[PDB]
Amino acid sequence: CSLDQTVAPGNLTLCGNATLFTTFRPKARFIAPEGWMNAPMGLYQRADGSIHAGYQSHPKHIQWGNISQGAAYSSDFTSWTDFNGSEGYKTIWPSQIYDIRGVFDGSIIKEGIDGYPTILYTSTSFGPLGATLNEAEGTETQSLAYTTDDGASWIKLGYGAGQNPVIYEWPETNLTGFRDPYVFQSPRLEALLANTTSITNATGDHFATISGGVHGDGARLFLYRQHTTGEFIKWTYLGPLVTTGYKESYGEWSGNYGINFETAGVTRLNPAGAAWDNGSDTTAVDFVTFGTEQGRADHQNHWPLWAAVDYEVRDNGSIEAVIAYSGVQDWGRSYAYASFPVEGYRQVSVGWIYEDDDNVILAKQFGYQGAFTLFRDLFVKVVENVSPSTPGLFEQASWSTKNSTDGMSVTVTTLGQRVVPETLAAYKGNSTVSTLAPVMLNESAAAYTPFSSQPTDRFYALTGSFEFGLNTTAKAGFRVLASEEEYTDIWFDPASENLTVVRTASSLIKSFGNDTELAKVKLYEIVGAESKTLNLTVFVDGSVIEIYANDEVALSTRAYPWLANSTGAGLLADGTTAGDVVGVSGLELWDGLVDAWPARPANTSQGLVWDGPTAAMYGLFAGY
Template identity: 35%
Template sequence: MKLPSAATGLFLGTAAATPLSLRSSTLNYNMAPPNLSTLPNNSLYETWRPRAHVLPPNGQIGDPCMHYTDPATGVFHVGWLHDSAGIAGATTSDLATYTDLNPNGGQAIVPGGINDPVGVFDGSVIPSGINGLPTLLYTSVSYLPIHWSIPYTRGSETQSLAVTTDSGRNFTKLDQGPVIPGPPFAANVTAFRDPYVFQNTQLDTLTSSQSNTWYTVISGGIHNQGPTQFLYRQYDPDFQYWEYLGQWWSEPTNSTWGDGTWAGRWGFNFETGNVFSLNEEGYTADGEIFGTLGTEGSDLPIVKQLTSIHDQLWVAGSVAKNTNGSVEFTPSMAGFLDWGFSSYAASGKVLPATSKPSTQSGAPDRYISYVWLTGDQYGQAEGFPTNQQNWTGALLLPRELKVQSLDVVDNALSREEGASWRVESNNTDAGTVELRTLGISIARETEAKLLSGKPSVEAGRTVSSAGVLPFQHSPESKFFVLKTNISFPASARQSGLQTGFQILASESEHTSIYYQFANESVVIDRSNTSAAAQTTSGIDSFTESGKLRLFDVLDGGEESVETLDLTIVVDNSILEVYANGRFALSTWVRSWYANSTEIRFLHNGVGQATFSNVTVSEGLYNAWPERA
């Protein structure tokens, strides 16, 4: 996935950045909005800009990539594609506040070299690589357009090296050709990009490699066969040669995990594949193998247009040698890393316990992942006021990934095949099973910072009547975190119950967030989110949802429905919803009116629900204290 996003079109080239000019403060947010695309450039710069998220000072952010912990300083580096003109980045010592590596968010590496005359796509960093320095393996691009739906031009994408000697501010390309000069011989690929470097003890054993060998997966697919990941390993100490180990994981064209209910589609092409190993504490080199990946595809069996689906998935599985001696990855479960329509291109990195963020928080070795929230429907939001806003997209809050175990009642709900969990063991005497899935939560340092202000406590309540009930103490701003637990009676499973909240609410606007048992989903109804959507065609307002099963659990020996544990982060226009340590759904909520700050309890009048531990932490923090 590259800027200006090929999600639904071709990679055609670069887009010119809009010059930063004076920002208008003359807009009246107490009156109905005009057609925002007719306003002066930069007039909407502050209107929906988030405070606590990662994004450049201006322009378009793209795929997160190039993350690493600097061995010399212990700080964590976060990178991203920026304005189709290379990779920019920042450092953080606490996973909450960031410092730009270069003035005005400038890039650390740009296209224009002998290997990358037209593009620099995603790359991944070996923290102690050539001469012990951080070394970037990245996709060097020589030809455009590139898209999974058209014939591939040979030589379009190669993998090259660059090294930094100034703490990541600049990555200098090696004066040589690519270290991986193209796809495997005679492979009719859909793509060959986004190398991700990692280490794994299981692969060391299976491939008879030395300990701490570096591997890389390159994402893509094969025309008329399906998406795939190409596996390579380091061949020499200087990382000049990479040995091809085969297509270690492939799926049939546009197929699904199970029936697709819990993990979308594998699509026609894989992008931004990451590989790492986890246990219940976090990262461990000998843990269960997981991966995150973006999938490009179509809802149609035969593609008749370039519009595509983009699912941001995770997968877990095992590795073994197959009959021809090559290594093969076999999935055992899969799911969505984020259910949001605009959430894509996740990339992460191991954050060791010795890093500055982990040393301060006492955290163990972890895997931290960032997800891109594209701000313009992958470039397809016609009429979006891009020049008026002068920034597009953001990275979602950093997430800790780990193995999550659940003890639940042994019944049809827990035994479903093709789901985003698997049965690890069973206790016949107790009538329970242990489930395993991917744990997804806001990084602990980030969440602590989000909640650092004094919370406002709202009285708990049981609701059964249809309607909305305003909070006693709603926030005064559009920057807050709402946390709560919602419990349900067993009868809720057979009802049409819908319950949750309205946020960013006023007489003119509101966004509804609720859980419904009918299809076991967390729903974000944006049909009334923004008055601007009524005047500006590029402001999306469709409803988004993601599946979350609440299992039956034992509580004091009695069966009950698992409690819904919600964390809702509102950072002006960015909404992130987390649930039960294993669910995330993120989207844009571009409210217009200044007084759209109210929170309300919401219930549809079917059955009852009990809200407890309801708190609102208002204000959030400034993630960029050094920016003007």
């Protein structure tokens, strides 16, 4: 095992555990100290204003198992501190018959048991568990725990009748899944149900969704309501909130609804952020965010989706969320998005970016797997004065259109996502910032043009505004993590409406994924404009490449170049001519970003362990 990054990579599978720990590792984002992580969980803003973030965690392993809540906190979403207790950075772990198979995703009741922050989580026990298996009632249940020390530790309710687990009966037969309770308050849903509470007797101020589906018949999001205000044991099933078909797709802009939902949440937004009105705010829109499984040929069979919904009240005192339009939260290697309320009328969303080593070839050598996305403010994106000749505009696929009275312009509404401003400000202020001169891409443009200032390592951000002709067939974008021999190309092709990440040359190491990422991006053309513009922001953080377009489209992916000098960046141009020109402006490079875990040393590995021969006997966890 040579770690010489000035020459071609050897056989890196001969390298020891965690010998590649720092080589590809993000430094500017949320990530576990070591080992396996997946979904964000237990997210809440604490009483002191700081953010608590939990995550599915398996320390000292590089595959999933004994799944626990790891946790940390931050005052600005950006610089984090690990909790440290008797179980290291874990704060909830399998410990009881009802959750011994895994402490799965959960969400926070801010004023819960005895007034304390309280988590409702999926407690798993033995038996087949999965949407493609024959799962039985009891394998996935929902349980409570509360914290008296602001998330340093959690106390579970006792096991038994009238205690944990608090939700165990399947609301319908033959479920594909029954997990990921999302607890939320909703003046909107309270107002809608107020005339029917005699039918169900459920009058509490908290709702909870549980994610699942029905074998052979598509995904389901089940709605529960807290039976009585101030009491947290009894939750009453109202009915299915979202019902989709077996591998149903709303189309090219909307992924696929698969066979089962995971990590679903419910929110209400307006142009400024979170909306807490009862329906009276005409600018507010109800949204569901949700993962789906088995509706995708790649990306671990997982789509992270969202839908705008219109609520209807059923005669039995339940709610049907009718999908109005449907989109994708991130088009790349991310999943398990969670959202949570933040002071100042905000709803903040964060997901999990998995590695691109699906055959587990170099995972042990890493000594870790996974990171978070950046934290994102959700809001209703409104585009005014949109031209009716915008191609495909009235398909209204992942957006809505409202015509002006005279029919000559359109207002477009969709889900907006932008990186939280605290992170952008901290990144910029800690970086060496190069404001770059605008670049006109025409007949003289090379395929690749390095920026006039270059990054110094694998931790940087780029921004640019690409102005295209309305009938362009030119392509342009950014190349990142680039040397002569390794590079990753981010292209936008307005003619096809496709944003791609080409990774055929991303790394000399051949075991990592190299498939082309793809997102659809609608450039809403503005009335009177003779051009259309793509604002593209790119974060490069170790191996993470996280792309944002127009405060709307997100695409997270991975690149693992071996060579030490595969850190360069610049502009890409294809088919730019004297006549078909691409004007690039607002160009800026931020080199360095922020050290997100300042108390951690560079190498936080504690080694890796094997569960031994019993792992295969129990059949629950891979064991490593």
